[model samples]
Target: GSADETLCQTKVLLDIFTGVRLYLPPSTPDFSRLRRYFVAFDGDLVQEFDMTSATHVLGSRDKNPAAQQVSPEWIWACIRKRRLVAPC
Candidate 1:
């Protein structure tokens, strides 16, 4: 017997952004929606681009060649799978 859908945890992120401190640039695709999603999960979206502070930098292109420069797809992927895997 399994406690299937006991409380409808669909809204829960479930370890998706445990240690993620994101820096989402204005140019990022679906920036508004991404910010909302992160905010809803308290995923720590930084307003300023602090390389030392941001764990992930979400942008349209590869600007920050040093930081963990990732695409917006990563966020969507995380939401779907609930597993935060670095983008390729």
Candidate 2:
């Protein structure tokens, strides 16, 4: 199903940032937030891909590009700094 594919893609994206599959427990805030964000787009795969790609590119630009993983706090700060999310 598309939702499964989307969640898989999300896992991949998170792994890229963490440099490992960060096993997220169900009901975890990060998992819940990301799932809601992805599903809010109503199955727009292209949009999701675009956001994933952009986030990866941004992460790659970090000072320590070779680091195994960037912290979630750092990533969220970067996103906020970049104003990727519209004010709401």
Candidate 3:
């Protein structure tokens, strides 16, 4: 009968991308559709393919070393870990 504990704590989804700005190649398919999922994670999807202001690229196609480069697989990994797991 342990019900006296305060119920102030609430569970919530750990926003994965609050300040993340993603860039996708123009005319790309399905990737833009995934924006909803990213937004659900509090992410920022750039309107156009502004590679210059992109902090994270959507796919591993462009190996530009300017901004943080990563693949869609990374998202699944983070989801599985249930946190912002670092890439190794």
Better of 1 and 2 by TM-score: 1
- Count clashing residue pairs in model 2: 0
Model 1, 1-88: lDDT tens digits are 1112211343444445445556678777556656655546656666544555556667622344344555656665565556677753
Ranking by lDDT: 1, 3, 2
- lDDT (10s digit) by residue, model 3, range 1-88: 1111111112122355445555543444435334655545665555443555556655542533344454454444443345544432
TM-score of each: 0.62, 0.25, 0.52
lDDT of residue 33 for candidate 1: 54
Query: Once superposed on the true structure, which residue ranges of model 2 sit more than 4 Å away at CA?
Result: 1-28, 35-68, 83-88
Residue 65 CA displacement from its true place in model 3, Å: 4.0
Instruction: Point to the candidate with the largest TM-score.
Output: 1
TM-score order of candidates, top first: 1, 3, 2
| lDDT, model 1, position 38 | 55
Q: For each candidate, what is the lDDT?
A: 0.54, 0.31, 0.45
So what's the TM-score on candidate 3? 0.52
Best by lDDT: 1
